[PDB]
Amino acid sequence: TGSKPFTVPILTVEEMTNSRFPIPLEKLFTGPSGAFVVQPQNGRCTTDGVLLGTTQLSPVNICTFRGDVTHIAGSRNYTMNLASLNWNNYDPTEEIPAPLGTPDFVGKIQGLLTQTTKGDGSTRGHKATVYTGSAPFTPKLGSVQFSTDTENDFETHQNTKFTPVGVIQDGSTTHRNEPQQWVLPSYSGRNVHNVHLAPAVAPTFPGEQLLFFRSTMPGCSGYPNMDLDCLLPQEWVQHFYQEAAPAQSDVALLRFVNPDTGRVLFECKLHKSGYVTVAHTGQHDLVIPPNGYFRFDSWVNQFYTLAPM
């Protein structure tokens, strides 16, 4: 009826980026999800381009922090007073769960904390870890804590950046017990309810499962669970944001096509609120050809039955 035609990118899975951590996608995965709550806040976008949760457009700002730091005496810990994505004042009253790009899982994220002194352009960088399950993790309040390897090198009142690399685990405890990718941090700290969240998703149609876009996070210490599943590639977020094509039903039928043959491998539902389901029962690593890609074919309804994956 004259709506702007909806499309998805023709990039292959391996040509795209995880929307929950700045690393490439590796594979597609489906499994049952009744045993956990699927409520990530990064990689959330409606098909007509409305960003949700803490989702923002940059693949390299995910799980980053910016601001200035204060040393906590008697430790190697620094409190970062957060700034916005472009180094302006952070506004805690904005109707979002936390600063855009904030991590959306409980875990210990390791990276580098870097700093420049404005006056002379001197710089410094130190390995640092943020414990997103810890009491000082209060990004919505404008404050997070980093554990570092220095007690004096960082200066006050100078622009400071955290660049994430990977995750760690406490090797004296049960292996792969953290990170917990489906447990949201408490963005305002212990026992304070989160706000303005993108909703939890579940396959609501009988016989369906979520389809996840999966990567493996680097591990930096211990025995971490390095699996990371997102609902939408970052490139799909960027694509929908720009196109802003209106959803003509609750569900977009996508076909996964092998361009080498022109043949469809499977079909799936892209729900207009921004997640994908498939008709399958059980945990399964999808085996796909390297040049395979998703193609929008038609608008269907909540009552459409998918061909079994």
Ligand X SMILES: CC(=O)N[C@@H]1[C@@H](O)[C@H](O[C@@H]2O[C@H](CO)[C@H](O)[C@H](O)[C@H]2O[C@@H]2O[C@@H](C)[C@@H](O)[C@@H](O)[C@@H]2O)[C@@H](CO)O[C@@H]1O
User: Rule CB under 6 A: which residues touch ligand X?
Assistant: 122-124, 153, 171-172, 221-222
Q: How far is the CB of 272 from its own copies (least distance, A)?
A: 21
> For residues 228 and 184, what is the distance between their CA atoms, to the nearest angstrom?
13
Query: Which is closer to its own copies, CB of 149 or CB of 190?
Result: 149
Residue given tokens 């609120």 in the structure block: 273
> Which of ligand X, its own copies, none binds 172 (CB below 5-8 Å, type-dependent)?
ligand X
Asked whether 270 and 47 are in contact (CB, 8 A), the reply is yes
Q: How far apart are CB 178 and its own copies at their closest, in Å?
A: 12
Q: Look up residue 150 and give its two tokens.
A: 């220095």
Amino acid identity, residue 70? Answer: T
Q: Residue 240, SS3?
A: helix
Number of neighbours of residue 275 by Cβ within 10 angstroms: 24
Count of CB atoms situated within 10 Å of the CB of 173: 10
237 and 287 Cβ atoms separated by less than 8 Å = no
What's the CA gap between 249 and 206, in Å, rounded? 19
Per partner kind, with CB cut-offs from 5 to 8 A, the member of its own copies, ligand X, none near residue 274 is none
Q: Rule CB under 8 A: choose which of 116, 150, 158, 249 binds its own copies.
A: 116
Which one of 123, 261, 291, 305 is in contact with its own copies (CB under 8 A)?
123
Q: Please choose, out of 72-80, 164-172, 190-198, 247-255, the segment that lies near its own copies by the rule CB under 8 A.
A: 164-172
Instruction: Choose among ligand X, its own copies, none what residue 176 binds, the Cβ cut-off being 5 to 8 Å by kind.
Output: its own copies
CB 26 within 8 A of CB 233: no
- The answer on whether 245 is annotated among ligand-binding residues is no
Between 136 and 218, name the residue whose CB sits nearer to its own copies. 218
Greatest alpha-carbon pair distance for the chain in Å reads: 67
Q: Per the annotation, where are the binding residues?
A: 307
Binding site for its own copies (CB under 8 A): 9-11, 14-17, 22-24, 26, 57-61, 85-86, 110-112, 114-116, 120-125, 127, 161, 163, 165-166, 168-169, 171, 175-176, 218-224, 226, 235, 238, 241-242
